Structure formats: C-alpha cells, structure tokens
Amino acid sequence: ALRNQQAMAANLQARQIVLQQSYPVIQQVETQTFDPANRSVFDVTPANVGIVKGFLVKVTAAITNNHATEAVALTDFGPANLVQRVIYYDPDNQRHTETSGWHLHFVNTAKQGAPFLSSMVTDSPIKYGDVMNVIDAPATIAAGATGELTMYYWVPLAYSETDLTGAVLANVPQSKQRLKLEFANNNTAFAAVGANPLEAIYQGAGAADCEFEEISYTVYQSYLDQLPVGQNGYILPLIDLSTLYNLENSAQAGLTPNVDFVVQYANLYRYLSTIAVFDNGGSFNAGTDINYLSQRTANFSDTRKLDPKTWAAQTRRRIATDFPKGVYYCDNRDKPIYTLQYGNVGFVVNPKTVNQNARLLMGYEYFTSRT
Amino acid sequence: LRNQQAMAANLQARQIVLQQSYPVIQQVETQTFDPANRSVFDVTPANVGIVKGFLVKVTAAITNNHATEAVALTDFGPANLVQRVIYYDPDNQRHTETSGWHLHFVNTAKQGAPFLSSMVTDSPIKYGDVMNVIDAPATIAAGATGELTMYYWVPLAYSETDLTGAVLANVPQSKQRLKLEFANNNTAFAAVGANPLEAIYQGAGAADCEFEEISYTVYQSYLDQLPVGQNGYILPLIDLSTLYNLENSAQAGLTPNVDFVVQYANLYRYLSTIAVFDNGGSFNAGTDINYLSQRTANFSDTRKLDPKTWAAQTRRRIATDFPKGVYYCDNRDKPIYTLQYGNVGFVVNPKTVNQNARLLMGYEYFTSRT
Amino acid sequence: LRNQQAMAANLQARQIVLQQSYPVIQQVETQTFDPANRSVFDVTPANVGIVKGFLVKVTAAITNNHATEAVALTDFGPANLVQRVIYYDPDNQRHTETSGWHLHFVNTAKQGAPFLSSMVTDSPIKYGDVMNVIDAPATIAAGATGELTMYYWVPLAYSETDLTGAVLANVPQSKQRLKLEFANNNTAFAAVGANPLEAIYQGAGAADCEFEEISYTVYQSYLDQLPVGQNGYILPLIDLSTLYNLENSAQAGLTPNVDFVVQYANLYRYLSTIAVFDNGGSFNAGTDINYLSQRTANFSDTRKLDPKTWAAQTRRRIATDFPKGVYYCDNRDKPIYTLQYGNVGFVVNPKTVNQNARLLMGYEYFTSRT
Amino acid sequence: ALRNQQAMAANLQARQIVLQQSYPVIQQVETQTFDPANRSVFDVTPANVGIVKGFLVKVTAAITNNHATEAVALTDFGPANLVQRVIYYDPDNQRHTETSGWHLHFVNTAKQGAPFLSSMVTDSPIKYGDVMNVIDAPATIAAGATGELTMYYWVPLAYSETDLTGAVLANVPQSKQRLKLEFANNNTAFAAVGANPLEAIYQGAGAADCEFEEISYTVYQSYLDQLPVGQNGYILPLIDLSTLYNLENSAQAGLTPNVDFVVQYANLYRYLSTIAVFDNGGSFNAGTDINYLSQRTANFSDTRKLDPKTWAAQTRRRIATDFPKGVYYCDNRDKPIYTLQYGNVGFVVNPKTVNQNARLLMGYEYFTSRT
C-alpha cells in the first residue's frame, strides 16, 4: 500500500542528505589526441569513486580543406557532429545512454534553457562576449585553409545537479564503467553538394578534398565524494540509484503527404522529452513541409496539435530561440509520457511534402527502472 | 480570520488540480479575411474544464501599392496587428479589456524577455531565427508585399502554476466571448508626420499601403480531467473567484516641470504598470522626462527615479529596454493596493510637452469577483 | 384556469428582471464589403443574459458611373439597403423572417413616427438634422458618389418594458444566427419603367450605378446581471416561451371591383398588418383602391374604409402617411386571433388592376413556442 | 430594516394626497427691463407660498448691428445664451441648481421630449404654426438692423408635475428664497469670426459693432396652494421635500487623439442625465471628431460604447431630433448613475481629432440628499 509512499519519502531524504553532506568534484579522467583516419572509436574508463553524475567531454579538431578552388560551409549541426555516437555502461554493465552526438547536444541545450554553453550577444560596452571560444567552428573553410573547432557534450547519468535520479554508485573495485565515444572521420564529416548533411560537419563543393588533421578529447568526470554514513552504512537514495536516465534515438520511415505519421511511444518508459528531426530526403526545412505536429493518446485525442510556427513558439519559451531547420522539440518533463497511465500515446507529424528517402529521426530522453 | 483556512485550502486544491488534471492546447477557430470588409470578430471558446488562456496567432500580407515611396515599421510594428481585445466569461463578467500593444508588452514582462523572441548567441550550431515566430519586414518598398506574423497570449490564469484568474467553463452552457479587433487600412499605416502609436508601418508611401489579407488562429489552453473528491470537484475557490485582468486608459493635461499624477483605484491589486508618453506623436528615449515615480499621499515617493535609472530597473526584468517612450513598473511581489481611491499614484514629471501630449496607461491587476 | 396564476407570476418575474438587471448595448460585429463579391452574412450574437434585440447600422457609398443620366431615390430608398433578415434562436427556432422595408415600417409604427427621424420645428436653437442618422441623397447625378446611412432594429422582445419574445441566451453554448441579406448591384438600381419596389435608386442612369462598398455594424441589446432567487433565476416564463415575430408574404389574383381577401392564419395573435399594393410596378396614393377592410366570416367588416379614411387612422399612429401604396393596420390592443384558419381576413377591393399586380403583406404577431 | 420601505410608502402617499388636494398656481413674481451695459445680474425674490415647483422665466431682447457693412448670424445655441447663468437658493440658503442657460435649456428640451416650447411643422392647411413666437430669434441681423428675440427657461425645483422630488416648502415668513439670473451683455453675446461661439448669441464679421438695446425678463413662480392638512398638520412628502433635484455643469480638459478621456461621476449623487459638449477649441463638429462615446464602470466594462451616429440615434428616440453640433446627451432617468451601487462610473469620449484648447463641458441633472 503506502509502502512506496514511504519509499519515495526515504529516497528524497537520502538524496537531500547526500547533496548536503558530500562535496562535488569534477576531475579529468583521460585525454587523447589522434587522427581519425587512424582510429575513431575510443573506450574511456571512468574512475570508480562515489556517486557519478555525468561526464563533460571537451572535443577539439583541426580540419583542412585542400580542394583546389572550392570552399565548404558548416551544416546546420556543424560541430555537434564531431562525436557521432556515445554509449555508457555502468559497473554492472547495464547500458544507460546510447545516442548520437547531435541528439545529446540538443538535450544539453534543452536542459540549459538556451544553446548549450553559448555566449549571448548584448549591448554591453564591457568586453564580455565570445572570449574563450568554448563551442566554436568557422562558418566556412576556404580552399587551402585549416579551421579549428571546439565542442562540448555533457553525458548525463544523474538527471540534474539536484535530482540524482539516474546517478551511478561506483565504489566497487574491479568492476569498471565504460564510456564509448565514436568520433567523426573524413567519411562522416564532409558532405558533397546535394548529399545528405545530417551527420556531417561541413558541406560544399570542396568536400571531397577535406580532411581532419587531428581530433582531441578530454573527459572530465563529475561525481560526489565523501558520501554521508549513518546507521546502516552509506545514506543513499535507493530509488535514484536504481533508475536509469537515458537518451536514445531511432529512425522511422513511411511518410506520405497529408497523412498522419504516428510514432508510438515504446511503453513503460517515462518519456521526459522528444525530439523529431524531419530529414526530408536530405532536405531540412523550416516547417514549410509540415501541416502540423502533435502528441496523441489512444482516443485520437490530441493534447497539442499545432501548426509548425505555433509548435516552434512553445520551443522558443523553452530554449529562447529555435532549434535548427527540421528539428522539433517537445517538453514533457513535469508530466512524462507514460503509457499504462493513459493508453498508448504517439508523436505525430502530418507532412505537407515528402521527398524520396524521407524519415523522422526520433530522440528520446526517459527514465526507466533498472534490472 | 478564517482566511488562513480559506487560503490554505485554496492552495491545496490548486496543487491537486495541477497534479491531477492534464493540460491541453487546442485550436478553436481560424479565419482569413480582408480588413476592407471587416476587422472585428467575436470568437467563441470551448466550454471545457478550467480555461487558462488563449494563444492568438495572427498573420498578414501588406502590399505597398505606392508608385515610388516605401514605409518602415513603427516602434510597435506587428504588435499593432490586433488593436484591442476583450474577454467575457460565462457569467458575463469581463476580464481583460486592453490594446494589442499593451497585451504584448505584458506578455514580454511575464516572459522576462521580448515575447517569443529568438536570442542571438555565438553558437556555431544553427539555432537562431529559423521559424520566424514573431516577424515583420523592417521596410516594405514601393510595389512590394510583406508577410508578418504576430502572437499574443490572452491570460485568464496568472501563470502555468498560479491559477488565480482562471475560468471554470465545464460549468453552464453560457458562452464565453473573446472579442478581437484587428488593424485595418485606416489604422495600420501612418503618413510621415502623423502619430505612429497605433500603426504598423509609417512612411511616404503609407497612403497607398493596404492589407492583402489577415488570418488568425486562436488556440485555447485549459486543464481537463479535473480531480473529483467527496463533495465533488476539488477546486481552488479563491483562484476561480478572482479576476486577473489587463486594462488600459489615457490621461492628458501634462505641463513642463509639473508632477503629472495618475491615481490608482482602490480594490484592485496592481501587479504592473506601463506608461507610454505619447508626446504629441513623438516618442523619445527619456529625454522629454525629468523623472517618474510611484507616490503615496502623505508619505512621498517610493521610487522617484531619473529615466535611465528607471530603465535600469526594467532591464533587470526583461533583459532589454521597452521601445522609446514606453515605461514599465513591476509591483508583483507587493501589489499597489490603496483601500482608499488614489492613496497611491503613478507620477511623470515631463521636461518637454508637445501639443496633444498624453500618457497611455496599461495595468495588470487582481480583484475579487465580489 | 391556473392561467391567472401563471400570468400573475410571469408579470411579477418580468418586473423583477427589469428592476434588477442592467441594460447593455454592445457592438458584436462590423464588416465592410463589396456587393459584387458577397451580400449575404450570418452574424453570430453573443450568448449572454436575456437578448432584447439588435440595432443594425448600415452605411453605403453608391457611384453613378453613367455618362450623363442621374438617378433618384425610390419611395423606400435606404430602407432597401437590407433586402431580408432572419433570426434563429439557440433552440434553432426562427423568430423574424421578413424584408428590410417591412422591418423598417414596423420600426416606424412602434416609434409612433418615421424611425429615428429628425422632426422639423421653428426652434431658433440649432437642433435639426445634425447627425444624419438615417440619410440618403435625393438624387445621385451622373459621375457622382452618394453616401447613405440606414438603421434597423430587429426585435426579439416586444419593447423595452414588455419582454414577450425576448430570448434567454446565457443558456446553452448553441449559437444564435442573425442572417442579413444586403442590397447588391442587381437589386439596388431600377431602370426607368422597371418596378422600383426593392430598389434604392431609379432613373435613366441606373444601369451604370454600382456600390463602391457597404458596411454594417450590429449592436446587441440585452439584460445582464439577471436576478436570482430560491429556485434560481427569476424569469418571466411566458415572455420567454412566446415568439414575437415579423413575417412577410405575397398574394396575387386581384380583379377590379372584387374583394381580394388575404386570410390570417390561426394560432397567431396578429398585432399589426401592412399591405403594399404593388400595382404592376406602380405605387399610387389610394387612387387605385375602392376600400380596405378587416373582415370576419359571417360577421362582416369591422373597419371597411375608403383609402383616405384608412390613412387618417394611420396618421394617428405615426403622425404622417406611409409611402405611396403602403397601408397600415394597428390591432395591438385586440390582436387578430382566429382560432380557426381564415375566420378573419384582410381585404382590399381594387379600383384599377395593372398587369402583375400583387399585395405584399407584412405581419407582426405573437405565438407560443408550443 | 423595512423602516425606509415604510418611509418610501408614506412619502408617495403624502405626495399623492398633496397633488390631489392642493391646486396648482402660476403667478408673476417680477418683471424688469434694462440695458445689460448698465446691469446684467439680478437677484429675484420668489414669494414664500406653499410648495414651490419651479420658475418659468420669459426673456426678451432687442439687438442692433451697427456695423457699416457686415452681418452676424445665430450661433448654434443662439437665444439659449440670453441667460449666462442661473442659481437658486432655498429658504435655508441651500443651493439647488447652478448652471448655464444653455445647459438648463437642453435639459428643458430633454424633459419635454422635443425642442423646448418649439412649434412643429406639419402639412395642416389650418393656420397653426409659429403664430406667437414663444422662443424666437432672427437667423441673421444685417448691418444696420435691429432684431427681436424671445426665450423661455424653466428652472426646476420639483422633478416634474407629478413627481415632487426636489420641490421646496416655502411657508416660513422672514426666510426668503433667491433666484439669481446672470444675463448676457455685449461682451458675451457677440463673437467675432474665428472666436469661440460657445457662450455667444450671434457671430459674424459685424460682431464688434453689435449692441443690446435692452433685455426684459418676467419670472413666473409655479407652486401648489391650499396644502392638505391632517392629523399632525400638513400632509407632506418628507423625502420629496428633503431631496435636492439640481443641474450643474463643469469643464474638463486633457483630451488627446485616440485615447479614452474619462470624466468620473462625482459619487453619491444619483445622476439622471449627462450632457457632454465637445468644444474642440472653438469648433463644434457633428461627431466627425469623435471615435466613440460611452459610460463605463469600474471593470472597464462599457454599458453603451457607441460610434457617434448610433449615440445620436438613441438621442433621436428621446427628443425627436439631434442636439446642436458637438452636444451629446445621455438618459439615465430610470436607472440613475449612482456610484456605491456599482463602483466608480465614468462618462467616456475617445476623440479622433483634438484642436488646441479642446475641452468637454459637462452638464449633469441629479438627485442628492439635503443637509
């Protein structure tokens, strides 16, 4: 009965005590510089200490355009595509997040409430601004030039700094975690004119002759040390630590003009957010190829059937700007989509135009029970 | 004072409603028309659950048919696509009755930044003004047609978490009335030298500008699946018996270097005040004002400030300045509440006063249905 | 006969409502259009309180594009700016369904003088036709543009003090429908020799006349803040369950010196009758009629009168004569009520009958919703 | 509790008895002929007899235009401006009406339901018509000519012939009433071209050389004699006789284009009618300088927000014609404006055009308690 109500209360209290008694630490775990032509997949081994909240991954790169005459220009995702995929496994080898660099980046932005680690432009005469180039990439790389890029990703375990749901307790020696990073290479980073720019960093007539010179990464692990001890050992939020907070993405196809394309939510998960990217056969449009988007439950009842601009309006309230062309976001944080609470639910897109090889790339943020 | 009990209960009921019901935003009406034929519409909301507000989307195409002269956006621009709004609840009681520009400025004050705007940053990832949510061409050249988009949020409930002012509409069949008066060919275009206050574009080609058409879509935001208890629906009675309204007014009689005082009425709890100094058609960036203040009779000013310092307080609220001649005052944490008519007034001591000068006031307030 | 009790209660409730509620007249819709594109509109009234009626303001600009010929007002003139009106209440029941000219003549009969007219007097103080409330140029010369203004009152309630026929609209969300069909380029202008009955102007330049545009504004008159009692709303149940309607019809088959009888239906309590003798497009001042009367089968005529004496009775009601060929009959104090279809008829014995002659009838009546 | 309900009933009964038992009388009180160049203010002393209902004031005048060549023409108010102001004080020296001749005249018209004491034009062949020139003034007075004018004003104490609210009981010897009449003179009666015609009788290029030759007035007092006596002395409607029925006017400035100009009702009074004159800097327009007029209560809720022609339509139903240019009327007789019954109320004018020195001249008709 009220056995869980007491469980919930115990969890929250334990969380509050851990946060007040422990001290946060962020420390470098590993750094490596390489040429992706040699190797692009790396398995980083996080340190086993206290409760792990997440990882901040710094990525830098140098790209050279050796085309004789043509330039290349940033794609809509640009440096967010420096990391193609990220996968994390905890000490019990349970997989948490497994998604694309672009999806992880869009969630980082959604959680910040503004473009992740960006520098806002203001009229201040004091010289604040893009001083440190935290996330940066040249808009174009001309024939014969070399550009430098910097990108950051936050790989979460814990939901936030104050909500430890999804965090990982790593104090078991001989049982390691694994943070796998799959980086871009010359094949994924450069798209020829007319090719699909989805996974690319630069696109243009000089693409065939573009090459990475090097990529470097530094992984910083954020955790809580000096865990509080009481009468039974460590005071720990048991629900928080046995819940997985994950990001995952998938691709759905089968769109036809003026027909509702419905992507069912894969039940049992508590979906906090949904990102839908309309890759219209390599074309990414600013809503003009869509009639409306919606979230619908078993009853054909729509809770937010909106035209594209109005849908975008809701997103502007969340991140203070629009996501790139063809990228749509839906916040369900306060009331997560959870089938079994109200029948099957689906994310809906009714397309106005559908090109060949059209598809919806879905990105989800969700909570689910461990084991 | 059984009030503590009433408030305690109200707040608990509000939380149960927010926790148990489910939010819905739904289109209730769309229409396209030519301002030459009509510009006043009465939208009928759906009578379902607890209504929180209405999101009104307005799009328009404006053609500059002048032979050689262009026109440029006024300071309010697309915010003048809707001239006025009035809302009547199922009990025939009015809530908001104000201008489109005042409604828009409050939307901005409540968001803490220009309403539904896209902030500019150094991000290399292509975030930005991708969807043109609120948009209008800076100028429309002779012979050109410009496309505009504007959004307004007409609030009933104070916010997503504070249901004060919300309307219970699952109630009687009696209809709600959301009245909208749109800009027309007579209000949208101002000739050079004319007052641009209510206009969208001003310039030498104004006389030959016209609307090709205007379209609006109203979305209703409400809470459905209301929680039921012993006695029935669990409802925040104080929230639902309180009105959260925006209203505007105009005052004249300004004289150089003399305090011009606009009295606040009693009974109303004023959350914010906006004062626009329409200096005979000229809108200046504080240079025509000595100071502004809020004053209580026999207790002097609580914030007598020079225009720039007054603007500094506003920058802390919306992260920028409101347009020229528009002044904002936040009293949300401690609402102006006189108890005696005029115990408190809004003050403007003008430096220069042109012919036909006046202050256009805008208010946000709470008041009991009584 | 528990009727005495019902009527006694109804009347008491009516008085409480009039005493306790507050009258409101409010704009519900305005629109400007070109008759070349459309001329039929369905206005949606607000569903609030007890609705008494609608004041419809119509303005129009008419251009005579003829090269050299003018046109002049017909006898009905601006009263033909609205060709027809139909009202449906929230329960899908129709009330008034009649022509604009008949509606206007009833507006006049109820006022006791030409509707919204300005009476001429010797006063040296400058009262007079200052505001041109109902107005139209006597002629519009070739190449000229004339401006017209017309007002119509569409009644639901019988009067400001008698709520019989009024509509309770705070009720269901179900919408009211006020349908208006305006004059157009095909009905407003009559060529010389053509029937001017439904036209606004007639003359040699008619073929080249056209509307520059027409605009209308509908104002809704209702009672708000309805009084509540033990069982709830204190309401005059008889008043609200009775229909007060105006309706028109056409009858033909007239023959010189023979009684032409238009039977009244049963069930309806006819308050007034208007008969227009459209003598094949000619409208005469009684010279084509021997007499008019109202007759009951097997009880002869109750008022068989020569045309001038019939007109004399009308002069006592509206202080002047209705236009040529228009005849009025007041039966307000003792409404025509047959109980058997045709027990009573309206009679016209014509002196001269032209080709295509007919009587256009107009009625004001009360009838139960049954 | 129902102490007033019984008071109201007692009052009405007393009123009914007084009306049925007493006999109405109208008798001359005073007549005087003078040149306003000598004196223009007169304090008339009404006779103290029975219940006084009001005064009918007959005013005649002769005006000469001695300009060498130019004429003058009647202003919109014309002879209504023969009396500039009227003030009445009762035996206790309590002031009742205090207003302008033009406002008093407009109320006389509103109460009659047609231009006060006018002769209606009809097709009658019998010679009815303007036979007696009860209220009359030549449309123009040519250079070298003399015109004759006649004007009548009814100064009310009682509301009407059947409603004695506001009447005055004057049966106290040694305590007199005062009816002060302030007449026009050469300065107020003639306006030059371009000057404000508000208070003037004639305006034109010959104005500077116009002069009154004389003005004459005759005041008739209307009262009820032979007051009914019962068991307690005179049977008198106590509420009627302790209520003041007054007319007053004032000027309000501060108008600006397209902004609502609100004139608040000065609470506690029961306002029966309101007259608003838009003196637009000396220009009087037929509604073209106004967007709308209205009466609004604390709630920004308008009970009759109307465009000028529709507002005029309501007035045509009341007086069978329009008031002069720029004069607007509002009837609240059956439901008097009374703050404390429904919050503050205001009369509203939203001007389309505002000239220099624009202002609203407000005229009120109201009931208020004595003492």
Chain B residue nearest residue C222, CA to CA: B92
> Based on the domain organization, do C225 and C237 belong to the same domain?
no
**CB contact set of C259 (below 8 Å; sequence gap of 6+):** C347, C348, C349
The CA distance from D72 to A349, in Å, is: 79
With CA atoms as reference, the chain B residue closest to A325 would be: B130
Beta carbons within 8 Å of D6's beta carbon, 6+ residues apart: none
Alpha helix (H) residue ranges in D54-176: 101-112
Q: Which of D296, D306, D298, D299 is nearest to D348 (CA)?
A: D296
Query: How far from the centroid of its chain's Cα atoms is residue A91's Cα?
Result: 22
Query: How far, in Å, CA of B218 to CA of B51, rounded?
Result: 13
Residues 6+ apart with CB under 8 A from B231: none
Are residues B268 and B195 located together in one domain of the fold? no
Q: Which residue in the block uniquely carries the two structure tokens 């009858």?
A: C251
Cα→Cα distances C241→C163, C165, C234, C266, C345, Å: 10, 7, 14, 18, 27
* CATH number, residue D192: 2.70.9.30
Could you give the CA distance from residue A207 to residue A209 in angstroms, rounded to a whole number?
Answer: 5
> What technique was this entry resolved by?
cryo-EM
How many residues comprise chain B? 370
The span from the CA of B145 to the CA of B62, in Å, is 5
| Contact flag B22-A324 (C-beta cutoff 8 Å) | no
| Three-class DSSP category at B46 | coil
In the numeric block, the tokens 């009481």 are attached to: A230
Distance CA B244, CA B335 (A): 13
Same domain, C317 and C327: yes
Radius of gyration of chain C (CA): 22
B215 touches chain A (CB under 8 A): no
Q: What is the spatial distance between Cα C226 and Cα A318, in angstroms, rounded to a whole number?
A: 45
In whole angstroms, give the CA distance from residue C358 to residue C279: 6
Where does residue B87 fall: left (phi above 0), alpha (psi -120 to 50 degrees), or beta otherwise?
Answer: beta
- Chain A residues with CB under 8 Å of B149 CB are 309
CB contact under 8 A, C34 and B39: no
CA atoms within 13 A on the CB side of A101: 28
CA atoms D158, D159, D162, D164: torsion sign: negative
Hey, what amino acid is at C243? L
Helices assigned H by DSSP within chain C: 3-20, 100-111, 237-240, 307-318
Residues with Cβ within 8 Å of residue B11, at least 6 apart in sequence: B236
**Structural domain count of chain D:** 2
- Token readout for D9 is 């009933």
CA neighbor of D106 nearest in space, from D274, D346, D293, D246: D274
C-beta separation of C39 from C188 below 8 A: no
Task: Identify whether the C-beta of residue D20 lies closer than 8 Å to the C-beta of residue D245.
Answer: no
Distance CA D190, CA D205 (A): 10
Three-state SS string over B193-213 comes to: CCCCCCCCEECCCHHHEEEEE
Q: A120 is written with which tokens?
A: 């806002």
> Among C119, C125, C151, whose Cβ lies nearest the Cβ of D80?
C125
Cα dihedral sign for B199, B204, B210, B216? negative
Residues D253 and D145 in one domain: no
Sequence-distant (≥ 6) Cβ neighbours of residue D27 within 8 angstroms:
D47, D220, D221
Reduced to 3 DSSP states, what percent helix, strand and coil does chain C have, rounded to the nearest 5? 15, 40, 45
Could you give the C-alpha distances from A299 to A198, B37, D128, in angstroms and in order? Answer: 35, 40, 81
Q: Using CA of residue C277, residue C282, residue C287, residue C288, what is the dihedral sign?
A: negative
CB D234 within 8 A of CB D28: no
Identify the three-state secondary structure at position D342.
coil
**Chain D residue closest in CA terms to B246:** D300
Q: For residues C204 and C248, state if they share a domain.
A: no
Q: How close B132 gets to chain D, by Cα (Å)? A: 31
CA angle D345, D347, D352 (to 5 degrees): 140
**In angstroms, rounded to a whole number, what is the distance separating the alpha carbons of residues D323 and C127?**
5
Q: Which tokens is D79 given?
A: 């002879």
Q: Taking CB atoms and an 8 Å limit, are C48 and B174 in contact across chains?
A: yes
Query: Can you tell me the distance from the alpha carbon of C270 to that of B369, in angstroms, rounded to the nearest whole number?
Result: 45
Are the CB atoms for C248 and C362 separated by under 8 Å? yes
C173–B177 CB contact, under 8 Å? no
Sheet holding A301-302, edge to edge: A261-264, A345-351, A290-297, A301-302
* Pairing relationship of beta strands D243-253 and D358-369 according to DSSP bridges: antiparallel
Q: Are D358 and D351 in contact (CB under 8 A)?
A: yes
Report the alpha-carbon distance of residue C96 to residue C107 in Å, rounded: 13
Residues 6+ apart with CB under 8 A from C309: none
Cα(A220)–Cα(D47) distance, rounded to whole angstroms?
106
Domain boundary among B229, B245, B264: B229
The alpha carbon of residue C348 and the mean position of all alpha carbons in its chain are separated, in whole angstroms, by 21
**Three state DSSP letters for B273-303:** EEEEEEECCECCCCCCEEEEEEEECCCCECC
Q: How many Å apart are CA B191 and CA A210, to the nearest integer?
A: 55
Instruction: List phi, psi (to 5°) of A305.
Output: -80, 105
Residues 237-266 on B with a CB inside 8 Å of D are 245, 247-253, 265
Q: State whether B148 and B290 are in the same domain.
A: no
What string of H, E and C letters represents the secondary structure of A164-191? CCCCEECCCCCCCCEEEEEECCHHHHEE
Cα–Cα distances in angstroms (integers) from residue A289 to residues A307, A308, A311, A362, D45, in the given order: 11, 9, 14, 17, 89
Within 13 Å, how many C-alpha atoms sit on residue C299's CB side?
Answer: 11
Q: Single out the residue in D206, D230, D254 at which a domain terminates.
A: D230
Same domain, A10 and A61: yes
CATH number of the CATH domain containing A302: 2.60.120.20
Cross-strand partners of C43: C178
The three-point CA angle A350-A352-A354 to 5° equals 95
Pairing of strands D301-302, D23-34: unpaired
| Mode of pairing for the β-strands spanning C344-350 and D51-65 | unpaired
CA distance B68 to B71: 10
- The helix/strand/coil state of D350 is strand
Residues of D in contact with C123 (CB under 8 A): 115-116, 118, 135
CA distance A367 to A244: 6
Q: Crossing angle of helices D101-112/D308-319, nearest 10°?
A: 70
Answer for the pair A366, A293: CB distance below 8 angstroms, yes or no: no
Distances (CA, A) of D15 to A68, D4, D25, D79: 111, 16, 17, 36
Q: How far apart are CA C338 and CA C325, in angstroms?
A: 27
Whether C305 and C313 have beta carbons less than 8 Å apart is answered as yes
Inter-chain contacts counted by CB atoms under 8 A, chains C and D: 116
- Distances from the Cα of D188 to the Cαs of D67, D191, D217, in angstroms? 17, 8, 18
- Residue A104 token pair: 């992880």
With beta carbons less than 8 A apart as the criterion, state whether B159 and B151 touch. Answer: no
The residue of chain D with its CA nearest to that of C24 is D303
A125 with A162, same domain: the answer is yes
Gyration radius (Cα) of chain B, Å: 22
CA dihedral (C159, C160, C162, C165) in degrees, to 10, reads 60
> Are the beta carbons of C188 and C54 closer than 8 angstroms?
no
A177 plus A259 within the same structural domain:
no
From A184, A212, A230, the end of a domain falls on A230
Distances from the Cα of C193 to the Cαs of B15, B152, B203, C201, in angstroms?
Answer: 77, 57, 52, 13
- CA-to-CA distance for B119 and D107, rounded, in angstroms? 62
Residue A194 region by backbone torsions, left for phi larger than 0, else alpha for psi between -120 and 50, else beta = left
Tell whether D242 and D220 lie within a shared domain.
no
In whole angstroms, give the CA distance from residue D262 to residue D268.
18
Q: How far is CA C292 from CA B25, C102, C350, in A?
A: 65, 19, 9
CA distance D23 to chain C (A): 32
Give the best residue of C108, C110, C111, C131 to mutate against chain D (max D CB count within 10 A).
C131
Nearest to D49 by CA among D168, D162, D218: D168
- Token representation of residue C260: 């032409």
Report d(CA C324, CA C322) in Å as an integer.
7
A232: buried, middle or exposed (CB in 10 Å: 19+, 13-18, 0-12)?
A: exposed
Site of tokens 């090889």: A357
Q: What Rg do the C-alpha atoms of chain A give, in angstroms?
A: 22
Q: Do chains A and D touch (3 or more CB pairs under 8 A)?
A: no
The set of residues, in sequence order, having a beta carbon less than 8 Å from that of B4 and lying 6+ positions away, is none
Contact A354, B152 (CB under 8 A): no
CA A47 to each of CA A72, A87, A171: distance values in angstroms, whole numbers, following the listed order: 40, 16, 9
Whether the CB-CB separation of B284 and B199 falls below 8 Å is answered with: no
User: Which residue type occupies D122?
Assistant: T
| Residue (of A182, A185, A240) closest to A214 by Cα position | A185
Give yes or no: residues C127 and C197 share one domain: yes
In the numeric block, which tokens belong to residue D215?
Answer: 């003005």
Of B40, B44, B47, the CB nearest to C27: B40
Which region, left, alpha or beta, applies to residue B4 given φ > 0 means left and ψ of -120 to 50 means alpha? alpha
Query: How many CB atoms are closer than 10 A to CB B296?
Result: 15
Please state the separation of Cα A75 from the chain's center in Å: 17
Structure tokens at B202: 């001003």
Closest CA to B282 of B370, B194, B205: B194
Q: Report the candidate in D309, D332, D304 with the shortest Cα–Cα distance to residue D322.
A: D309
Angle at B296 between CA B291 and CA B300, to 5 degrees: 60
Distance CA B60, CA B213 (A): 6
- The residue written with tokens 């004699």 in the block is D225
Collect all residues with Cβ–Cβ distance below 8 Å to D265 and sequence separation of at least 6.
D271, D337, D339, D344, D345, D346, D347
Q: After which residues is chain C broken (C to N over 2.5 A)?
A: none
DSSP string, A284-349: --SSTTEEEEEEEETTTEES--B-HHHHHHHHHHHHSSBPSTTEEEEE-SSS-B-TTSSS-EEEEE
Shared-domain flag, residues D49 and D197:
yes
Indicate the resolution in Å.
Answer: 14.0
DSSP of A3-72, one letter per residue? HHHHHHHHHHHHHHHHHHHSEEEEEEEEEEEE-TTT--EEEE-----SEEEEEEEEEEEEEEE--SS--E
Cα–Cα nearest to C64, from C147, C123, C182, C166: C147
Nearest Cα to Cα of residue A207 among A217, A198, A215, A197: A197
Cα–Cα distance, B12 to B236 (Å, whole number): 8
Phi and psi torsions of D147, nearest 5°: -110, 150
* Domain encompassing residue A272: 231-371
| DSSP one-letter code for B267 | S
- Residue D200 contacts residue D220 (beta carbons within 8 Å): no
Residue type, C315: R
Cβ(D350)–Cβ(D86) below 8 Å: no
Q: What is the rounded CA–CA span in Å between residue A107 and residue A81?
A: 14
Rounding to the nearest 10 degrees, give the CA dihedral for residues B183, C154, C261, C266: 130
